[PDB]
Amino acid sequence: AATDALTGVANRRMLDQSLRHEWFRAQRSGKPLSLLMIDADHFKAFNDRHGHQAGDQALRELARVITTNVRRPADLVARYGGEEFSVILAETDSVGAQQIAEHIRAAVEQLSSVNEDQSPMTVSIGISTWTATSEISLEQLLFAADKALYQAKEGGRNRVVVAA
Numbered sequence: 001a002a003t004d005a006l007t008g009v010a011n012r013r014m015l016d017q018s019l020r021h022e023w024f025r026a027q028r029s030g031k032p033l034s035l036l037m038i039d040a041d042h043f044k045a046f047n048d049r050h051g052h053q054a055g056d057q058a059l060r061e062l063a064r065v066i067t068t069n070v071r072r073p074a075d076l077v078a079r080y081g082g083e084e085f086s087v088i089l090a091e092t093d094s095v096g097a098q099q100i101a102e103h104i105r106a107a108v109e110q111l112s113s114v115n116e117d118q119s120p121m122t123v124s125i126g127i128s129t130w131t132a133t134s135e136i137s138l139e140q141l142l143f144a145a146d147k148a149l150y151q152a153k154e155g156g157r158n159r160v161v162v163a164a
């Protein structure tokens with residue numbers, strides 16, 4: 001009821017619920033709250049070449065990479081869509097959120113080289129960040145991360161785009 005059966009991380013309604021509570025918390029603490037939107041690149045073509053089982057295995061590997069780079073108590077990793085992953089980085093500023101994203105992006109790119117069975121694969125990442133002086137809302141925070149994820153898919157996949 002709270003985890004994704006395939007990947008084992010949180011599911012959508014758990015992400016939305018935890019983000020609402022982590023939102024009001026950051027409003028009081030004044031600590032930066034960052035979001036990551038992680039979509040798999042050329043996934044439809046991936047399932048066409050290697051099949052639906054390899055795509056599921058590629059999602060679990062992507063989930064393992066994110067959770068390997070997201071480890072603190074106030075962090076959450078969830079399956080936000082059939083091919084997306086959303087992570088909460090509470091008390092993390094924009095600079096540190098980018099370093100996490102680069103680690104995740106680089107690790108997914110090298111998953112084919114390190115393990116023979118894996119097929120080449122990349123991810124696109126969008127980042128948004130609330131700071132203590134910002135006036136945006138929670139819906140605007142989520143909007144800026146999906147938009148930056150969209151800008152990552154547009155300007156050529158396999159990259160990290162920070163919202164503005």
Ligand SMILES: Nc1nc2c(ncn2[C@@H]2O[C@@H]3COP(=O)(O)O[C@H]4[C@@H](O)[C@H](n5cnc6c(=O)[nH]c(N)nc65)O[C@@H]4COP(=O)(O)O[C@H]3[C@H]2O)c(=O)[nH]1
Pocket residue numbers: 069070071072075089090091092093096097099100
């Ligand atoms: N929310 C979240 N953010 C993350 C995580 N991993 C990295 N970051 C962000 O990435 C920045 C770079 O961390 P680093 O290069 O691993 O370099 C880190 C790391 O090597 C070390 N460090 C800090 N906390 C821990 C810890 O709990 N365990 C270990 N082993 N090392 C730590 O201190 C350095 C300074 O880190 P910061 O100044 O905090 O800045 C960190 C942090 O803002 C994570 O699992 N969750």
